[PDB]
């Protein structure tokens, strides 16, 4: 992901 | 004959084939490998990067990277190479001769599917494409029109209830907890025995171990006590150098994380509670029909005895007058693709593609209007 | 690939129906020994130019003769980026047209590339290996151009990341 | 070189040479050097009326009118002090260095003289930075004609500064590669946790350009930067101005290096095809060993 | 909001981050006056984009979502609910009263709570109710600037009264009947 | 170690 | 709640 978690 | 291509393109394993078949033509790990040394021998295979099974074969001298992470594409320069190897090396078919049917997990960034469409149209020039949700294709493959799918994909778990073909987009649940996280957890807990796996080439060995020896426990505490009291539950595996390891208690602690994310330091709830909550999110007057049509999918639900554990947990959660029936076909590992080979082959579907000229008119944002 | 299989089979079968070349000295000039399909001096030593096409815009024109064969290839070019890349690639192929003994420094008008196999190339070099080279080019050119396109996309992404990182 | 630089090399070189010749005590020689820069800018370093003791550096820009507006010379005056004089006939800005009244530390004035174009641009641009800092909404929004067929629409609000580049390339190959280089420009915000919101559009112009004369059309691309008060504060606005100033030229530069990049891969694949052809040449039975030059071996 | 934020690419899932999402809501969200017009605007201009700074230093940028989160209050169909919006709820609860008192209720509708502190909810509610109610009645959305504490402020006003001291539930009375007494004394 | 690395 | 909705 972009915010929260990686991906 | 000319038929649409169906490319599953999961988070851990890319499966592609032609529509109208009952098995994917090509199945290979979606990894990209690049060498981390410098050749010294003249003329011996000096090429930029290996992809697919070739990377698995030469994994000793490469650093492997997965393009898709948690169901999200995080490296497009590698996803493009994956699709190129699928088109021109595995299927060996021109991309601009057949429509394509891609899959995507639900509750995903819109930029993901927008870039998927942009890549499929600008780069490969496919005449048509479509991006369907994976759980819907799994249900199509199951051969029914009502039920709750629990696609524990390798990269991502998600549940999508469907009733009479009417998906309920407010009861869909997604849990970023799947095969890769269990692989990392197995790597973390294998150190207790003394086996140390750090590099990616060793993570592949750990995945091969997980995919072979691990199993889910019907009752966790009972199995723990049994493994502690007697050395009758240990198994032996031979690494690809001659070494032999013996794993006991660890066998059922890796997949147990699915039902207890607290092991992995997550606040989330197990997949059993996820499915139960996704069912209770629906209106009451249909819940029974879901209770008796729970469907599994994904390569992470292939663990032995997972149907029993899921049925026991849900029966403990749900009321004592509803019939729980965990539909777990022995071919689930490809259901997401199988339904694809069905959906792309229907005659009432040929008007739901995203034609090339539609994209040329309305930009890549048309995927939100056409694909559900 | 497997979508070009009948097209490539037809092209290969037409290639080894031509390429049955023989030595021949010119008729319109005293002692020159020139390829008869390039000069077009005598209309009796020229076989019918046969076209093999997979669709409207991908084709092979084969012009036979008694001591020469001219094989022009019109490659698939889907959009403008593929057109630019195909042009530049064919041009970088022409640049070395003495290492490729059967190549031609300029393509026939309307076609993307052109090979000119005289009789010396079939007497001093393996004939079936020349056929195999032409068919392998036709097999792999689309794949290589697609990889060029992906490389251009990656370069664009890296340039964007190198700019927007400084803000 | 990845990022284009903002200081001109010819100005710095010429002025440093003149200042070294003057500081050593040598008699001054004539100077008449005309040259250009990016975006159609024209420089002219000369002497006023054959006076070999004064050096006048004049610059002609494309945002001719936006710099004549009231308040568009605050930065130029602030940075150049007494060097700023009336423009030379035909040019737009003009500095005048007296080779006999040069202060000590001649490096600073030359470092600030090589950035004459950057300073003329930042002077007409900090107006909106201030219009946003002072907490006023609806301040003046304009269109800087920083080129002749492309425009930069600047707008200042209570909480942001919107910059919309209307850009178009001249050559067909450059247009085709620029479509890609501009489509892939929103994938840059994954390289930093703090990058201005970038929006790309070529179907239709944004709703900011519906009351203004910024260049629009069906061959133009629109790139919108939304600079927030963390990119336009009084400490990080120099880098922001440099980047917004050299953005178009940087994109053009990298479009023209993409071709020299692709040529290497094309040479590699050409050699790879030559290696497939080489299977047709029958291997010789015996080769004569030669020398580095190519002459007969002359020995066993 | 947590669900629609994933569209941009931000994944808040933990209860700790639900507080961050609630903060983003009460800091940036606002009710649109004309929903379709705002949807056409946010999809065609960069005038709705707003940046928020998470506690770890990252900055997210929300545009459209800023007015999609509270819009659900007027279209519960966004949440899969079947019921009607809050404006239709108000209008219905008015229409179920007697005919003689409908005008006064139309004139003295008063918002409250902490969810009505959205920029532009009073005007949207007025527009909706005026569209629903007849044309001869006048709609006045009395939205005080302290409506986040009205239930407390009024609650204080009641307790400080002198005629209210008889409505209490004294200890002896609870000792007499039990917890059921709350059904008789309290209305 | 026993598997992986020496120790 | 007990029946209907959670609470
Ligand atoms: N029989 C099995 N038992 C346990 N885990 C398995 C088994 N088969 C595959 N897996 C794991 O599950 C994943 C396979 O899921 P898959 O169907 O390939 O979904 P995806 O396409 O997202 O990878 C892999 O990560 C693999 O390690
Ligand atoms: Mg899958």
How far apart, in whole angstroms, are the C-alpha atoms of residue B18 and residue B7?
9
Both D138 and D265 in one domain: the answer is: yes
Both E39 and E57 in one domain: the answer is: yes
Both B310 and B203 in one domain: the answer is: no
- Topology of domain C1-167 in CATH is Yope Regulator; Chain: A, (3.30.1460)
Angle CA C16–C19–C21, to nearest 5: 140
How far apart, in whole angstroms, are the C-alpha atoms of residue C111 and residue C74?
5
Give residue for tokens 């992995």. B264
> In degrees rounded to 5, what are phi and psi of residue D157?
-120, -175
Both D12 and D79 in one domain: the answer is: yes
Closest CA to B255 of B305, B296, B328, B298: B305
Chains contacting C with at least 3 CB pairs below 8 Å? B, D
Query: Using the beta-carbon criterion (under 8 Å), do B76 and D187 form an inter-chain contact?
Result: yes
Closest CA to B26 of B93, B109, B106, B78: B93
Neighbours of D97 (CB within 10 A): 23
CA of E7 to the centre of ligand 1 (A): 27
- Secondary structure (3-state) at B165: coil
Both D36 and D57 in one domain: the answer is: yes
Query: Using the beta-carbon criterion (under 8 Å), do D183 and B118 form an inter-chain contact?
Result: yes
Q: Is B15 left (phi over 0), alpha (psi -120 to 50) or beta?
A: beta
**Pocket perturbation via mutation, ligand 1, pick of B214, B254, B300 by most ligand atoms within 8 A of CB:** B300
Angle CA B266–B269–B274, to nearest 5: 140
In a domain? residue D87? yes
Measured between CB atoms, does D198 come within 8 Å of chain E? no
How far apart, in whole angstroms, are the C-alpha atoms of residue B153 and residue B176?
10
Both E68 and E99 in one domain: the answer is: no
Both D29 and D8 in one domain: the answer is: yes
Per-residue three-class SS string for B40-103 = CCCCCCCCCCEECHHHHHCCCCEEEECCEECCEECCHHHHHHHHHHHHHHHCCCCHHHCCEEEE
In a domain? residue D300? no
Both D74 and D110 in one domain: the answer is: yes
In a domain? residue D256? yes
CA of B293 to the centre of ligand 1 (A): 23
Each residue of B194-217: b (16+ CB within 10 Å) or e? ebbbeeebbbbbbbebbeebbbbb
Angle CA B182–B188–B194, to nearest 5: 130
- Secondary structure (3-state) at C150: helix
How far apart, in whole angstroms, are the C-alpha atoms of residue B340 and residue B334?
10
How far apart, in whole angstroms, are the C-alpha atoms of residue B141 and residue B329?
10
* CATH code for the domain of B363: 3.30.420.40
Both B235 and B93 in one domain: the answer is: no
Closest CA to D248 of D188, D182, D177, D172: D182
How far apart, in whole angstroms, are the C-alpha atoms of residue E77 and residue D252?
49
Query: For residue A1, what is the nearest residue in chain B, using CA coordinates?
Result: B72
How far apart, in whole angstroms, are the C-alpha atoms of residue E11 and residue E27?
19
- Secondary structure (3-state) at C159: helix
E positions 159-178 inside 8 Å of A (CB): none
Distance from CA of A4 to the nearest CA of E (A): 5
How far apart, in whole angstroms, are the C-alpha atoms of residue C53 and residue C72?
12
Residue B318 structural domain: 135-176+270-335
| Structural domain boundaries in chain C | 1-167
The first and second tokens of residue B126, run together, are 């496919």
Both B86 and B97 in one domain: the answer is: yes
Query: Using the beta-carbon criterion (under 8 Å), do E13 and B267 form an inter-chain contact?
Result: yes
Both E2 and E78 in one domain: the answer is: yes
User: What residues have CB less than 8 Å from B123, skipping those under 6 apart?
Assistant: B80, C146, C149, C150, C153
Query: For residue A7, what is the nearest residue in chain E, using CA coordinates?
Result: E9
Closest CA to B136 of B352, B308, B362, B319: B352
In a domain? residue D160? yes
Task: Give the orientation angle of helix B335-343 with respect to helix B134-142, to 10 degrees.
Answer: 80
Beta-strand runs (E) in D157-286: 161-167, 197-201, 221-227
The first and second tokens of residue E11, run together, are 């994944």
Measured between CB atoms, does B366 come within 8 Å of chain E? no
Containing C73, the helix (H) or strand (E) segment is strand C68-74
The first and second tokens of residue B329, run together, are 């076909």
Radius of gyration of chain G (CA): 4
Nearest CA to ligand 1 atom 23: B12
Residue D8 structural domain: 1-131
Neighbours of B116 (CB within 10 A): 24
How far apart, in whole angstroms, are the C-alpha atoms of residue D60 and residue D91?
5
> In degrees rounded to 5, what are phi and psi of residue C118?
-85, -170
How far apart, in whole angstroms, are the C-alpha atoms of residue B366 and residue B113?
10
Query: Using the beta-carbon criterion (under 8 Å), do B243 and F1 form an inter-chain contact?
Result: no
Give residue for tokens 């494309």. D62
Q: Across-strand partners of B326?
A: B294
* CATH code for the domain of D277: 3.30.1460.20
CA atoms within 13 A on the CB side of D286: 1
How far apart, in whole angstroms, are the C-alpha atoms of residue C160 and residue E4?
27
CA of B201 to the centre of ligand 1 (A): 17
Method used to obtain the model? cryo-EM
Least CB–CB distance from D207: residue in E45, E51, E58: E45
**Ligand 1 pocket, residues with Cβ under 6 angstroms:** B 8, 10-13, 153-155, 179, 207, 210-211, 214, 298-300, 302-303, 333
Both E95 and E66 in one domain: the answer is: no
Q: Which is it for strands B294-297 and B326-327: parallel, antiparallel or unpaired?
A: parallel
Both E93 and E52 in one domain: the answer is: no
How far apart, in whole angstroms, are the C-alpha atoms of residue D212 and residue D276?
60
Both E53 and E120 in one domain: the answer is: no
């Amino acid at each position: 992901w972009x915010a929260x978690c990686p991906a | 004959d000319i038929a649409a291509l169906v490319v599953d393109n999961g988070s851990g394993m890319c499966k592609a084939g032609f529509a109208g078949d009952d098995a994917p033509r090509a199945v290979f790990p979606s990894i990209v490998g690049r060498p981390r040394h410098q050749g010294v021998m003249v003329g011996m295979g000096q090429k930029d990067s290996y992809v697919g099974d070739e990377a698995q074969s030469k994994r000793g001298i490469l650093t492997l990277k997965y393009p898709i992470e948690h169901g999200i594409v995080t490296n497009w320069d590698d996803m493009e190479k994956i699709w190129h190897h699928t088109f021109y090396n595995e299927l060996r078919v021109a991309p601009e001769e057949h429509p394509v049917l891609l899959t995507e997990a639900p509750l995903n960034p819109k930029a993901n599917r927008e870039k998927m469409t942009q890549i499929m149209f600008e780069t490969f020039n496919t005449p048509a494409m479509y991006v369907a949700i994976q759980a819907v294709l799994s249900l199509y493959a199951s051969g029914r029109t009502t039920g709750i799918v629990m696609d524990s994909g390798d990269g991502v778990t998600h549940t999508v209830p469907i009733y009479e073909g009417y998906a309920l987009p407010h009861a869909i649940l997604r849990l970023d907890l799947a095969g890769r996280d269990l692989t990392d957890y197995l790597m973390k807990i294998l150190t207790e025995r003394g086996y140390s796996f750090t590099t990616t080439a060793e993570r592949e060995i750990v995945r091969d171990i997980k995919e072979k020896l691990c199993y889910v426990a019907l009752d966790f505490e009972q199995e723990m006590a049994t493994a502690a009291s007697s050395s009758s539950l240990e198994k032996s595996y031979e690494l690809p150098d001659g070494q032999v390891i013996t794993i006991g208690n660890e066998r059922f602690r890796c997949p147990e994380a699915l039902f207890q994310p607290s092991f992995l330091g997550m606040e989330s709830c197990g997949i059993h509670e996820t499915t139960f909550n996704s069912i209770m999110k629906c209106d009451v007057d249909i819940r029974k029909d879901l209770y008796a049509n729970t469907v599994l999918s994904g390569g992470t639900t292939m663990y032995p005895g997972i149907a029993d554990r899921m049925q026991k947990e849900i029966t403990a959660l749900a009321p004592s007058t509803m019939k729980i029936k965990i539909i777990a076909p022995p071919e689930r590992k490809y259901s997401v693709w199988i339904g694809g080979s069905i959906l792309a082959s229907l005659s009432t579907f040929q008007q739901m593609w995203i034609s090339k000229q539609e994209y040329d008119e309305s930009g890549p944002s048309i995927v939100h209007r056409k694909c559900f | 690939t497997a979508t070009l299989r009948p097209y490539l089979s037809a092209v290969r079968a037409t290639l080894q129906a031509a390429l049955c070349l023989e030595n021949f000295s010119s008729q319109v000039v005293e002692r020159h020994n020139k390829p008869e399909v390039e000069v077009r001096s005598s209309k009796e030593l020229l076989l019918q130019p046969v076209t093999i096409s997979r669709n409207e815009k991908e084709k092979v024109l084969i012009e036979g003769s008694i001591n020469s064969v001219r094989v022009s290839i019109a490659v698939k070019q889907a959009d403008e980026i593929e057109k630019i890349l195909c042009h530049k690639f064919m041009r970088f192929m022409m640049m070395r047209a003495e290492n490729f003994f059967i190549l031609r420094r300029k393509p026939v008008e309307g076609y993307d590339i052109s090979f000119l196999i005289t009789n010396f190339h079939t007497e001093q070099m393996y004939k079936h290996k020349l056929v195999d080279f032409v068919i392998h080019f036709m097999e792999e050119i689309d794949k290589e151009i697609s990889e060029m396109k992906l490389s251009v996309n990656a370069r664009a992404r890296i340039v964007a990341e190198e700019f927007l990182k400084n803000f | 070189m990845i990022l284009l630089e903002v200081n001109n090399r010819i100005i710095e070189e010429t002025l440093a040479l003149k200042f070294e010749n003057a500081a050593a005590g040598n008699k001054p020689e004539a100077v008449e050097v005309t040259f250009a820069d990016f975006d159609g800018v024209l420089y002219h370093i000369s002497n006023p009326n054959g006076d070999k003791t004064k050096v006048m550096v004049s610059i002609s820009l494309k945002f001719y009118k936006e710099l004549q507006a009231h308040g568009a010379d605050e930065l130029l005056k602030r940075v150049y002090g007494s060097f700023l004089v009336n423009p030379e006939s035909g040019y737009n800005v003009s500095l005048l260095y007296d080779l006999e009244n040069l202060p000590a530390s001649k490096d600073s004035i030359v470092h600030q003289a090589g950035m004459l174009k950057r300073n003329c641009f930042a002077s007409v641009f900090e107006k909106y930075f201030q219009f946003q800092e002072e907490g006023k909404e609806g301040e003046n929004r304009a269109v800087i004609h920083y080129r002749d067929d492309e425009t930069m629409y600047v707008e200042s609000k209570k909480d942001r500064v919107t910059v919309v580049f209307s850009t178009v390339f001249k050559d067909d190959d450059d247009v085709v590669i620029g479509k890609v280089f501009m489509q892939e420009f929103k994938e840059g915000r994954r390289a930093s946790h703090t990058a201005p919101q970038v929006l790309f559009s070529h179907r239709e112009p944004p709703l900011e350009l519906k009351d203004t004369d910024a260049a629009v059309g069906d061959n133009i691309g629109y790139i919108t930067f939304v600079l927030f008060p963390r990119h336009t504060n009084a400490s990080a606005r120099d880098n922001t101005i440099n980047l917004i100033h050299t953005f178009r030229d940087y994109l053009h530069y990298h479009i023209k290096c993409s071709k020299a990049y692709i040529h290497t891969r094309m040479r590699a694949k050409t050699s790879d095809f030559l290696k497939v052809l080489n299977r047709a040449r029958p291997d010789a039975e015996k080769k004569e060993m030669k020398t580095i030059t190519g002459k007969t071996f002359s020995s066993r």
